[PDB]
Amino acid sequence: KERGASLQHTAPFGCQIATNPVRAVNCAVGNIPISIDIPDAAFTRVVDA
Amino acid sequence: PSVTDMSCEVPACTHSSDFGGVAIIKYTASKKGKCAVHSMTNAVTIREA
Fold first, then answer.
1. Nearest Cα to B49, choosing from B31, B32, B36?
2. Which of A10, A23, B1, B42 could cross-link with B33 by S-S, CB 3.0 to 4.6 Å?
3. Contact status, residue B47 vs residue B17, Cβ threshold 8 Å
4. Pairing between strand B3-12 and B22-29?
5. What is the least distance, in Å, from the CA of A44 to any CA of chain B?
6. Is the peptide bond preceding residue A21 cis, with omega within 30 degrees of 0?
C-alpha cells in the first residue's frame, strides 16, 4: 500500500527497467570504445574513385 | 610521337617493398604510338617499361 515511487522514475539518467530478467536499459552515461577490423574488400583504391 | 603538356600528380603513395606508389600523369602527344618511360634517379624504380 505504501510502496512509493518505482525506480523507473527515480533512476538518474532514466534507465528503463524491465523484468524476467531484470535489466536497466537506455541510460546515457559515459562513452563506448569500438574497434572495427574491416577487410580491404570494401576499401577502394584512390584511383578507382 | 611527340609529347607536350606534361603534368604529374600523386593521389597517394606508400614506400614499401612493393609498387606502393601510384602516379597519374596528364600528357598530350602528336599521334598514337608507343613510348618508353624511365626514372633517372636510382632512389626510385618503375615497374612499367
1. B36
2. B1
3. no
4. antiparallel
5. 13
6. yes
